Amino acid sequence: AQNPNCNIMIFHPTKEEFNDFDKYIAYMESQGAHRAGLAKIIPPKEWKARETYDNISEILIATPLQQVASGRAGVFTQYHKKKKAMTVGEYRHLANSKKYQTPPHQNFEDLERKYWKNRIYNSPIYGADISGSLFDENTKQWNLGHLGTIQDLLEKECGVVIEGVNTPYLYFGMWKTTFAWHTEDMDLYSINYLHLGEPKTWYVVPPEHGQRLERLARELFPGSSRGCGAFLRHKVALISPTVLKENGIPFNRITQEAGEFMVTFPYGYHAGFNHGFNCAEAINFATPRWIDYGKMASQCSCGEARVTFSMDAFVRILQPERYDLWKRGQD
Ligand SMILES: O=C(O)CNC(=O)C(=O)O
Ligand SMILES: [Mg+2]
Ligand code: NI
Ligand SMILES: [Zn+2]
Structure with a gap:
């Protein structure tokens, strides 16, 4: 078995290997990359997403989200308070302000220490989940707006044509902006390109051990767990x-x-x-190997999770027994 310790693998595809996206994902899986739950791909030196980022300041963040924490420093929840619209140029200035800017630090490990010590005592503002793309239309390789759609994958594998669309999303971050523990909708893949700016630190649980994280979470968030399975x-x-x-x-x-x-x-x-x-860009995608995960994915039916239009067909076709309850949660 490849990668039996489930380590995060880092790949350096050549420009030739960067042509065929599906083939490269399958290659990474042949080397055991999926066992970690996460892989890094460093593009060939010849590639670029677009020419420059000098002209993005007028993008609008219609609903910036203030991420307010509750709990203890290592075990907390966050809720999202909606803020007034602002442009990316305005948001960048806010991120760089004394109230929100990254503190002085030695290295990534020092900054990680500071994040976990202090995150709960601040409420950073995240420009998350903005439909759109920063890839140039002429970028032919790993262009997250030009990927094969999940609807087409389901149709290719299973023979059933379904409604729905699959487009990317932009994320504008600042110090301490946080993504909570999750798997993707319908346990899909995701791909995330960090277009510009400061880093993003990730934590990941191997898929084979996901239920260990779920059991801890039920213990640590016992009211939430009674509310929703x-x-x-x-x-x-x-x-x-x-x-x-x-x-x-x-x-x-x-x-x-x-x-x-x-x-x-x-x-x-x-x-x-x-x-x-x-600024990051991300989208969900599928491969043949996903179908079995999609069929088994948990679902929230309590009403809280509320998701895209296109998840309806995935539930309807892959999980017909769950469909009626899940759709009630949507309505
Ligand atoms: O970048 C973020 O805030 C969150 N991104 C993801 O969870 C992802 O790409 O799957
Ligand atoms: Mg602009
Ligand atoms: Ni994600
Ligand atoms: Zn729920």
């Missing part, structure tokens, strides 16, 4: 590496820098935080 779908719970280690949960960590891709694999729980002002 899949409450991590709400994307609000944080647990620190120190707490994971104390509870024997297998995990790994890695820091993504500008110009790098990360892929999350089906049922790979992940969480993390941004180091400072940055």
